[PDB]
Amino acid sequence: SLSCDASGVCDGRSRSFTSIPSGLTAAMKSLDLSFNKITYIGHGDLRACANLQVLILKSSRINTIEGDAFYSLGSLEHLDLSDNHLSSLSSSWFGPLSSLKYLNLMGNPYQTLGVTSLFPNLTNLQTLRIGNVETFSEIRRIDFAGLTSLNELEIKALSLRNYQSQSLKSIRDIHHLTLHLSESAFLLEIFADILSSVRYLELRDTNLARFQFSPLPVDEVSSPMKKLAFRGSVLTDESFNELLKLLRYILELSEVEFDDCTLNGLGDFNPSESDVVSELGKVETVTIRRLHIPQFYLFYDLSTVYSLLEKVKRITVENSKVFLVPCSFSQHLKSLEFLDLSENLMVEEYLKNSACKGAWPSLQTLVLSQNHLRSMQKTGEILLTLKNLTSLDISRNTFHPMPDSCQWPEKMRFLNLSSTGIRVVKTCIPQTLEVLDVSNNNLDSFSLFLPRLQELYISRNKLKTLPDASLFPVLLVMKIRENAVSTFSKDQLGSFPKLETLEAGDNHFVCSCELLSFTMETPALAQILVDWPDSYLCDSPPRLHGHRL
Amino acid sequence: KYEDLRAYYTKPSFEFEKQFGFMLKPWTTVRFMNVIPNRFIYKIALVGKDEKKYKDGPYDNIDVFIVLEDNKYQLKKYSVGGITKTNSKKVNHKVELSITKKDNQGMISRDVSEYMITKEEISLKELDFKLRKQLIEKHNLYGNMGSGTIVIKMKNGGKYTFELHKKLQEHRMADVIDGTNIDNIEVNIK
Ligand SMILES: *[C@@H]1O[C@H](CO)[C@@H](O[C@@H]2O[C@H](CO)[C@@H](O)[C@H](O)[C@H]2NC(C)=O)[C@H](O)[C@H]1NC(C)=O
Numbered sequence: 261s262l263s264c265d266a267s268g269v270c271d272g273r274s275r276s277f278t279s280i281p282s283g284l285t286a287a288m289k290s291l292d293l294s295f296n297k298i299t300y301i302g303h304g305d306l307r308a309c310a311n312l313q314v315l316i317l318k319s320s321r322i323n324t325i326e327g328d329a330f331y332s333l334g335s336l337e338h339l340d341l342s343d344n345h346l347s348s349l350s351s352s353w354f355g356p357l358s359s360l361k362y363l364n365l366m367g368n369p370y371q372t373l374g375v376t377s378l379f380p381n382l383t384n385l386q387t388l389r390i391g392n393v394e395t396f397s398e399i400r401r402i403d404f405a406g407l408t409s410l411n412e413l414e415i416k417a418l419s420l421r422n423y424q425s426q427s428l429k430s431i432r433d434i435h436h437l438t439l440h441l442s443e444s445a446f447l448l449e450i451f452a453d454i455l456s457s458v459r460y461l462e463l464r465d466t467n468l469a470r471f472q473f474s475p476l477p478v479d480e481v482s483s484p485m486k487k488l489a490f491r492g493s494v495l496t497d498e499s500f501n502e503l504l505k506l507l508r509y510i511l512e513l514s515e516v517e518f519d520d521c522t523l524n525g526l527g528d529f530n531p532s533e534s535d536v537v538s539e540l541g542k543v544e545t546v547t548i549r550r551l552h553i554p555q556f557y558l559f560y561d562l563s564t565v566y567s568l569l570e571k572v573k574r575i576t577v578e579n580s581k582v583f584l585v586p587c588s589f590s591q592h593l594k595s596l597e598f599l600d601l602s603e604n605l606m607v608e609e610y611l612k613n614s615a616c617k618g619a620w621p622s623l624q625t626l627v628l629s630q631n632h633l634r635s636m637q638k639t640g641e642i643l644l645t646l647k648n649l650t651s652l653d654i655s656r657n658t659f660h661p662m663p664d665s666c667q668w669p670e671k672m673r674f675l676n677l678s679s680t681g682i683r684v685v686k687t688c689i690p691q692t693l694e695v696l697d698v699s700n701n702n703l704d705s706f707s708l709f710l711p712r713l714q715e716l717y718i719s720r721n722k723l724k725t726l727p728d729a730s731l732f733p734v735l736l737v738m739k740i741r742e743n744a745v746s747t748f749s750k751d752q753l754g755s756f757p758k759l760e761t762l763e764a765g766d767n768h769f770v771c772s773c774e775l776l777s778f779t780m781e782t783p784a785l786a787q788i789l790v791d792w793p794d795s796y797l798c799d800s801p802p803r804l805h806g807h808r809l
Numbered sequence: 810k811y812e813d814l815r816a817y818y819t820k821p822s823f824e825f826e827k828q829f830g831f832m833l834k835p836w837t838t839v840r841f842m843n844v845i846p847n848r849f850i851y852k853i854a855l856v857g858k859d860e861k862k863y864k865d866g867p868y869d870n871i872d873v874f875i876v877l878e879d880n881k882y883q884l885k886k887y888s889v890g891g892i893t894k895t896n897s898k899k900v901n902h903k904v905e906l907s908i909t910k911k912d913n914q915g916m917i918s919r920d921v922s923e924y925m926i927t928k929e930e931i932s933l934k935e936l937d938f939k940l941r942k943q944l945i946e947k948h949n950l951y952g953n954m955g956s957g958t959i960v961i962k963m964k965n966g967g968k969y970t971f972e973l974h975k976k977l978q979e980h981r982m983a984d985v986i987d988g989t990n991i992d993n994i995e996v997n998i999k
């Protein structure tokens with residue numbers, strides 16, 4: 261009822277097993293027993309697979325496991341017990357798993373990790389996941405006893421009732437800590453215990469409206485934390501300020517993210533200049549996605565944000581209904597080098613103010629993909645204010661046909677026009693371009709002379725002929741999949757003098773001797789075509805249809 | 810008795826040129842125009858002829874004369890009317906300001922000064938407010954006396970009149986006139 265391959269990888273997934281299947285062997289290296297109905301696991305059910313390296317028992321209905329059930333799994337490296345029905349954990353289970361690297365106990369209705377440390381012998385553990393939405397309510401100092409270093413630690417404690425002080429402090433290093441907290445009640449206690457270990461902190465679903473700061477024990481060395489992210493949090497202008505005060509403890513913080521967050525209240529907070537945080541330390545990257553401001557009304561004093569983003573080099577604000585970056589605000593971002601405003605509401609009329617005379621002085625890369633831009637001509641003219649812009653992405657914008665004449669930033673060498681619905685390319689596009697992406701459009705041909713072009717992306721278009729080499733005397737890379745070419749003679753191939761990489765795959769070809777002879781004569785061009793011959797299937801005739809070369 | 814007028818017409822005023830005006834989600838009964846010359850988002854109510862005048866916008870190259878006041882919506886940065894088109898050319902158009910005052914002891918005095926017009930298009934809001942303040946500071950308007958008129962005389966006859974015993978009607982603050990067509994100004998305080 262189960263099938264294994266030649267590498268000892270056996271599939272017993274989505275079966276109706278009510279117990280571990282019999283006749284397992286020492287030749288088995290991987291076992292997938294997910295989506296089953298194994299209510300009970302006995303002492304010898306898994307004794308035969310002494311060489312098992314991977315054990316997935318995800319989504320079964322496991323409610324009982326004998327203490328010594330894993331006695332012979334000394335070679336096990338991966339144990340996934342997520343989404344099961346284990347309401348109690350036994351330290352006996354993990355004792356013989358000295359080689360264990362990944363352990364998932366998340367999604368089980370247990371209230372605690374037990375009265376006995378579960379992991380003191382998992383010396384090789386790198387990843388640990390625990391907790392649940394409804395019942396996990398307490399963290400004790402012994403819970404994580406024995407762990408020195410972890411790459412990823414995820415703790416779901418949305419229903420946490422008590423955290424024993426110094427519990428998280430025993431872990432020396434944690435590259436990525438994910439915390440699911442519904443309230444901010446224990447945030448300060450937890451934070452204090454992770455200043456020396458966590459390199460990347462992620463907070464999910466936390467309501468921080470009631471959060472209030474208070475001085476933490478200043479300690480010996482600096483925090484190794486480089487990234488801090490908030491996911492699904494709720495903030496107020498007041499509480500947001502309180503959070504910033506934590507920055508004094510993570511002086512090496514370089515990146516901050518706010519994803520799917522909500523900012524409530526009106527827009528007035530009016531504090532003294534002392535409770536206001538105006539410094540952002542060494543943070544150079546700020547990333548915001550799907551931010552909801554349900555009452556963007558009473559808000560009026562943007563300057564606190566001016567000192568916050570003063571020394572910031574990278575900013576991302578995705579899918580957050582942005583329609584305007586005020587000129588005066590744009591002029592204050594003197595250090596900004598990268599700005600991403602994808603999936604917003606930018607239109608030329610508002611963009612003219614955002615990229616006003618003096619806006620984003622140091623900007624090098626600007627991404628305006630999937631906005632409401634309609635005109636390439638007016639847009640290039642508007643962006644002329646950006647003297648250092650070198651890369652522009654205006655993909656996923658519905659542009660009207662382009663004209664013969666256009667003005668663009670003098671240093672612009674990269675341009676993304678993917679998915680703009682264009683049918684023709686005209687001299688609007690500057691010859692200063694080194695990289696051009698015009699994929700996923702409606703082009704029937706390409707006749708634009710670009711003397712400096714090194715890379716052209718034009719996949720998913722309607723070209724029936726690879727474009728003339730003379731249009732690109734120095735092209736290095738060309739990707740033209742999902743188009744409409746069918747032949748590719750040696751002449752045109754050798755025509756590009758500097759060409760290195762070509763992607764003609766996933767196309768519809770005609771299968772003729774006049775071509776096949778060329779295929780056999782020089783397979784030395786297999787080092788110019790990627791995904792060859794995987795994606796180079798034929799179409800005609802019906803005999804060779806869907807057959808590789 | 811004239812304490813309210815003196816308080817209002819001694820408020821600080823703000824003026825900004827070449828501003829970018831925009832409209833938001835109309836959250837209350839009266840639409841607002843927003844400008845951010847620096848770091849403050851200013852909300853300016855659209856009343857009177859401005860309701861017809863401004864639609865979805867955006868509106869570039871506007872000047873604003875702003876006076877901040879107590880209001881219902883509890884906004885902290887709110888002025889009313891006073892929106893005009895910015896100068897196309899620089900203007901220094903000097904006009905005569907005459908001031909007649911009949912004091913508490915029936916004595917009639919007449920004084921004169923010059924008033925510098927610097928805008929091609931100027932709001933009644935701006936003229937009313939600045940002139941009354943000048944009259945308050947220098948001629949004790951709303952001290953013992955708080956009646957009479959300000960009259961803006963245009964070169965081709967027309968008049969714009971501000972009655973001093975009460976605040977300027979709200980809708981007229983959006984009313985704009987040709988700054989370069991003002992001939993003179995006559996004040997009569999009594
Ligand atoms: C130009 O932009 C497009 C999209 O705006 C990029 O194409 C892909 O977009 C999808 C979005 O559905 C992403 O998932 C992919 O990662 C994107 N890249 C690829 C290679 O598929 C495209 O990559 C951009 N061009 C360049 C040169 O960066």
Ligand SMILES: *[C@@H]1O[C@H](CO)[C@@H](O)[C@H](O)[C@H]1NC(C)=O
Pocket residue numbers: 621622647648
């Ligand atoms: C380009 O970036 C430099 C970086 O310091 C900045 O000083 C300058 O103002 C920007 N613009 C020009 C025209 O150099």
Ligand SMILES: [Cl-]
Pocket residue numbers: 583832833834
């Ligand atoms: Cl809008």
